[PDB]
Amino acid sequence: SLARLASYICGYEVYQISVSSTYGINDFKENLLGLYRKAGTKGTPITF
Amino acid sequence: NPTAGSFNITPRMQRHFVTFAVQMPNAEITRAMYYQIIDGHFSSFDVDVAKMSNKLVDATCELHRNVMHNFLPSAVKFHYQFNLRDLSNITQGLTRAIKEYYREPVKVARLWVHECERVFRDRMINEADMAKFDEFRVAVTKKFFDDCGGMVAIEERPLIYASHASMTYTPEDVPVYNALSSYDVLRKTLED
Numbered sequence: 001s002l003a004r005l006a007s008y009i010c011g012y013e014v015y016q017i018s019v020s021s022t023y024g025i026n027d028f029k030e031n032l033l034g035l036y037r038k039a040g041t042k043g044t045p046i047t048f
Numbered sequence: 049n050p051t052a053g054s055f056n057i058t059p060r061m062q063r064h065f066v067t068f069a070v071q072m073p074n075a076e077i078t079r080a081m082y083y084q085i086i087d088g089h090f091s092s093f094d095v096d097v098a099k100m101s102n103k104l105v106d107a108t109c110e111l112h113r114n115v116m117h118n119f120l121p122s123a124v125k126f127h128y129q130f131n132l133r134d135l136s137n138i139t140q141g142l143t144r145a146i147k148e149y150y151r152e153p154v155k156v157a158r159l160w161v162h163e164c165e166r167v168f169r170d171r172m173i174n175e176a177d178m179a180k181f182d183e184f185r186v187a188v189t190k191k192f193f194d195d196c197g198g199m200v201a202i203e204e205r206p207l208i209y210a211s212h213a214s215m216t217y218t219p220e221d222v223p224v225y226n227a228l229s230s231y232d233v234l235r236k237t238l239e240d
Contacts, residue, residue, distance in 0.1 A: 005238075009212055011220030045221035 012047035052122055072131065079109050085139050090156055093146075096196075097156045103192035104160060107185075108135055110192070114184035115168050119177060128171055138163035145209055147225030155227075157198025161185065162207050205230070213237045 004014050015035050017028045038044040049055045050071075083105040090101040097104075112134055121130035141163045148155060168181050189199070201207040205227070213234045214226035229237075 006212070009220065009238075010223040011218070045219075 007047040010047075012045050015046050015048045049122060055122075075109060075113065078132070078135070079105060082108060082135050082139065089139065089143050090151075094151050094156065096152050100153055100193060100195060100198075101156075103195075104156070107189045107192040108138065108160075108164070111164060111185050111188035114188065115181050118180055118184070119168075119172070125173065127173065134167050137167050141166070145225050148209060148227045153196045153198045154200040154204070157189075157193060158201040158204075158207060158227075161189075161199070161201040165207065210234065 007014050017023075017031050019028065035046065035048060039046050051057060083102070086101045086105045086108075090097040090104065092098075112130075116130040116134075119125075119128055119130070121128050138160070142156075142159055145159050145162070151159070164185055165181075169178055172178050172181060209225040209227040210229040211220070211223035211226060213229035214224065216224055
C-alpha cells in the first residue's frame with residue numbers, strides 16, 4: 001500500500017510483472033528485459 | 049569476502065600466484081578522506097556549516113568506530129556491512145538530499161543523523177542494539193557537534209524530508225525535498 005503510495009505518487013512507475021502460480025518465468029524475464037530497455041535506452045522514470 | 053559460509057578459498061588458486069589481502073584501512077587515513085570530503089560538501093557549500101563541519105567529521109569517525117566496535121560487518125549478521133561504504137553512503141546521501149533549500153547547521157546535522165541512522169539503525173535487527181547505536185551517536189555528537197543546535201532531526205519533526213505535501217506536478221519522478229510540512233498537513237493533502 002504505502003509502497004505504491006510513495007513510489008507511484010513519486011512518479012516512478014511501479015513496474016511489476018503480471019504473475020500467477022504458473023505465469024511464464026520466460027515471459028516474466030522478457031517483460032523484465034522490456035523494463036531493462038526502457039530504463040536504459042529511454043531513461044524511463046521507473047521503480048521496479 | 050573472507051571465508052564464511054559460501055565464502056572460502058581454493059588452495060590451488062594461489063599455487064604459484066600471489067594474493068593481496070585488502071580490508072579496513074587506518075582510521076586517520078579514513079579521516080583524511082572524510083574531513084576533506086566534509087570540507088568540499090559543507091565547508092565549501094554552507095558558511096553556517098563551514099564554521100562547524102570539522103566536529104561533524106569527528107562526530108562521524110568516532111561514532112562509526114563505536115558502532116563497529118559494538119557490531120560486526122560479516123560475523124554475526126549478513127544484514128550488516130561495515131566498511132568504507134558506511135561513511136561513503138553517509139556522505140553520498142549528505143550530497144543527495146540537499147533540497148529543503150539553504151541548509152543551516154540544524155538541517156545539515158539532521159541529514160547527517162539520517163545518513164548515520166539509515167546506514168546503521170535499520171541495518172540493525174531490534175530495540176537494544178538500536179539504542180546502543182543511538183547512545184554512540186548522541187554521545188559523539190554532543191561532544192563534538194554541540195555548539196549551534198543541530199539536532200532538529202528529531203525534535204523539529206520526524207527525521208524525514210517531505211515531498212508528498214510539497215511536490216512538482218509531473219516530475220514527482222524525483223520528488224523534491226521540502227521537509228517543512230506537518231502532521232495533518234500530510235494526512236489531509238495525501239487523501240486528495
